[PDB]
Amino acid sequence: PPNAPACMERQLEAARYRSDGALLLGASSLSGRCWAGSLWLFKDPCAAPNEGFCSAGVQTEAGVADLTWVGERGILVASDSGAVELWELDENETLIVSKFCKYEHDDIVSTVSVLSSGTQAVSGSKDICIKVWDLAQQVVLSSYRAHAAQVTCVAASPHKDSVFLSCSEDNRILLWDTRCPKPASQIGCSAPGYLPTSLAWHPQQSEVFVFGDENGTVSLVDTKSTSCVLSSAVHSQCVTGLVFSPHSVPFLASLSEDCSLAVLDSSLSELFRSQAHRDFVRDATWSPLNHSLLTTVGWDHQVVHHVVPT
Amino acid sequence: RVSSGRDLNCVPEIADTLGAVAKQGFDFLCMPVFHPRFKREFIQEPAKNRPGPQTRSDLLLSGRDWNTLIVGKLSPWIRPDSKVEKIRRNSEAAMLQELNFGAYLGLPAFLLPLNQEDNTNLARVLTNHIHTGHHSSMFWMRVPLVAPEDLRDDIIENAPTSGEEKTWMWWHNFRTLCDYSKRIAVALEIGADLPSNHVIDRWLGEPIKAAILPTSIFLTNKKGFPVLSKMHQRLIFRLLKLEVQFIITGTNHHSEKEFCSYLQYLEYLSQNRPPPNAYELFAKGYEDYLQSPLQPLMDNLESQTYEVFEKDPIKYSQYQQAIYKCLLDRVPEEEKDTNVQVLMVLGAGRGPLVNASLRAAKQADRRIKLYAVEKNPNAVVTLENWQFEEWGSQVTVVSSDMREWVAPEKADIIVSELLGSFADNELSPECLDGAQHFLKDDGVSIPGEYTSFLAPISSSKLYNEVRACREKDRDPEAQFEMPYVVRLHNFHQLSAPQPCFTFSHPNRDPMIDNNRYCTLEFPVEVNTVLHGFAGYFETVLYQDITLSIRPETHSPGMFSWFPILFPIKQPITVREGQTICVRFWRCSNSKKVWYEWAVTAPVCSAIHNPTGRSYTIGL
Ligand SMILES: Cc1cc2cc(C(=O)N(Cc3ccc(C(F)(F)F)cn3)CC(C)C)ccc2nc1N
Ligand SMILES: CSC[C@H]1O[C@@H](n2cnc3c(N)ncnc32)[C@H](O)[C@@H]1O
């Protein structure tokens, strides 16, 4: 393919499925002479991560820490360079062109999430700052410094254009609402537990979300409540991400640094486990075409397609 | 000129980054040796057996580049003081892995963060790495002026915003665990919201080797060039007196201007500092350099030792002025040609006071007869060469000890410069007392009075240097029981200087006793750690003519004397409002004279230098 990197870096950092079925990939080189990242589009998911069988491809300036779809052709990228990059697919969907590259964070942009309004997105970074972006005008609308440590994960509300979660290494889980004068509101267990690591709203209940900590515990939390609804020790190491299945009654896909993948039910009871990876499991995405498939990428350069018994 | 560096947390390729940073004008580069997001596993499989290199090769730069251009940075995911055990074990191994690789590259400095209160396990791992082999690389501790929690915005609604000095206690408790290691310095990080002057004044005494300046704290003038507030400029100006390396972190927020504009503003302020005081310009190269106090009575000073005495015109002009006024008061106008005064320079050295007494005689239009008594025979050769070629029979060089010299006649005036940093630390009382017999009953002593002043100081650097003065074949703590002549610089005065000992000449007392006992109490209105006592002195040559190295009454331009420093074995913590109570003794026997001192409040220290076991002044 044209303008396509000959090879992609070993550490696969993200994997996101588009509505039609194309798989968005994000790899970054964490070792070797060069420390950079790339962006890949795989209309054929079963051909990933082979670079010769990709639909589109481009390599970024620095590494790809976290990415997410912006509609059906935009790719928002959180780079190590302190910049939030937005890349767009051309009409041919064969090239990936850079839209804007705004260096607004002073350290690594660790997490990004597009708000439900589609035109705005929040970005968390190690600079202890959460920024609300305007994808149209390519400008930071607001810069919040409410945490005291590096922002670990930010997650936008499914249907609320002004609500988004955030957690940092200060053991704080902040529920945001830019409609308030003081938008941040510290939630979670009143007793300080282990550091939060991942966040995931429930795809149906606008008040329910899950979060995993550094100790491997996945917790079920309701925002209207102020105490844990339910928790379960799922992994032996830090929980990296949490993804919900697109079912009506959705399952929860948990992935950690223990090189394992787990799928729990609504009661956080284990229904599926996979040690297919040999390194850290970084992302997991459900197929919108077949709701029993779960594509996971890791630093071992594996793109495994898990059959989920549903 | 300013030494500066660029802090970066993302380096794609070292060759391109180091060149762009060098083009912008930085001298070194702060960068991670391993990838910041490359979390590694050391125990649990299969993440333990991660193939491939763990970082990039050392051959990307020359050994000369690593030794002088690259400053290491610990990975941000390394938390040795975590509460999860698994995170500790890996953070220990990861910190050792990065610290060993840092020493493998021969990096001159390494950055480690003090971003919380408990860094005890971090201190142990670093101490184990320091006590592994013998190296001299520095370890820069990244600690902010104000804590991150104390700098957050009040955006949370259910959690609104000595407690404001908490970051210094982070550093103090860290270096204490590491036993004041010489390889551990402070990389002081500056925030947009500067703290109290108390906290600022407290950091000044600490070994601040680097100053980190984020781009978010820079203001924007009308043109758009990055500037600072009137408070930040006052901070940068006092940082330049410590001669630190400034570090610029964060991305470019003044994207209209070139990124090197941040750097040009620092060189702008540096060349706009107040003109260097002639004392600072002259004594440059002696800041905090410990020197053994001179003993011109027990030893014979070398030629270049006398040469540093005479390079001070202000010192001898005051002596000339004091003798000038004393001549006019003793001989009236009608007796200006019939009355010849008998001046005796007791300790003439190479004859600067003899020349000053001659200039004071011509200025006063009076007749004098000079005796230049000097015990150092190597210096008497200089006096007799001066006496034969220029002075003539007016000056009578006497190569003897003033305490033993049998003078042919009595003296109208006796002039001496037998004063050290602590006034009487060269036994000027005992010398003038022995020479007191051949002074007329109405004879004038110049100086006629001197007084030593003491001030409690705080300087973890000076304490670390005295601590390094341990020598073989003597008491291991003997270095703490002796004073040092030193131009004090990186220190913090904890209270106003108070007088200590005082001597008057001629001593009309029938029972002459130069032994002294003085108890001083010092109000300390700040929290600090006492490390020693600074010693100054004031002396009265004649009437209004005075000399002083005491800071508040320091003689302008006089750079002859450095302050003296009495250390203490164990540093003493002092709180706000507490009073430091120190007691000094001036003991003496027939052969030796020495000082003993002890702190009695807030806590008690040991009596330092008992019987002169560690330090004596020779009679
Ligand atoms: C007459 C006299 C002078 C004394 C001076 C000192 C004194 O401070 N130094 C340290 C010093 C001073 C100035 C400078 C520089 F570089 F600025 F010139 C450098 N080093 C001793 C040095 C002059 C040999 C100590 C005791 C003294 N005793 C005396 N009787
Ligand atoms: C100008 S520094 C002090 C000078 O006084 C001299 N000096 C010190 N003590 C005596 C003494 N007791 N008798 C004569 N000269 C002395 C020293 O040799 C030195 O040159």
Numbering used by the authors:
A (entry chain B): 20 to 329
B (entry chain A): 13 to 173, 180 to 637
Question: What does the paper behind this entry write?
Answer:
PRMT5 is the major cellular type II enzyme and regulates gene expression through methylation of multiple substrates, including histones and RNA splicing factors. PRMT5 preferentially methylates arginine within the short consensus sequence “GRG” but derives additional substrate specificity through binding to substrate adaptors, including pICIn, RIOK1, and COPR5 (9, 10). Using shRNA-based screening platforms, several groups recently defined the Protein Arginine Methyltransferase-5, methylosome protein 50 (PRMT5:MEP50) arginine methyltransferase complex as a selective vulnerability in MTAP-deleted cells. In cells, MTA accumulates upon MTAP deletion and was shown to inhibit PRMT5 enzymatic activity, creating a relative PRMT5 activity deficit in MTAP-deleted cells.
To elucidate the binding mode of AM-9934 to PRMT5, we solved the crystallographic structure of this ligand in complex with MEP50:PRMT5 in the presence of MTA. In the resulting molecular structure, protein domains are organized as previously observed with the PRMT5-TIM barrel domain in contact with MEP50 on one side and the PRMT5-catalytic domain on the other side. AM-9934 is located in the catalytic domain in the peptide binding site, where the arginine substrate would bind during the catalytic cycle, and in the vicinity of the coinhibitor MTA. The 2-aminoquinoline moiety mimics the arginine of the substrate with similar interactions, a salt bridge with Glu444 and a hydrogen bond with Glu435 (6). Moreover, another H-bond is present between the carbonyl of the ligand and the amide of Phe580. The quinoline rings are also in van der Waals contact with residues Glu435, Trp579, and Phe327, and with MTA. In addition, more nonpolar interactions are visible for the rest of AM-9934, where the isopropyl moiety has hydrophobic interactions with Leu312, Val326, and Phe327, while the trifluoro-pyridine group packs against Tyr304, Val326, and Phe580. Residues Tyr304 and Phe580 form a π:π stack with the pyridine ring of the ligand. The molecular structure of the complex allows us to rationalize the preference of AM-9934 for MTA-bound PRMT5. The natural coinhibitor, MTA, is in contact with AM-9934 and its sulfur atom is at 4 Å distance to the ligand primary amine.
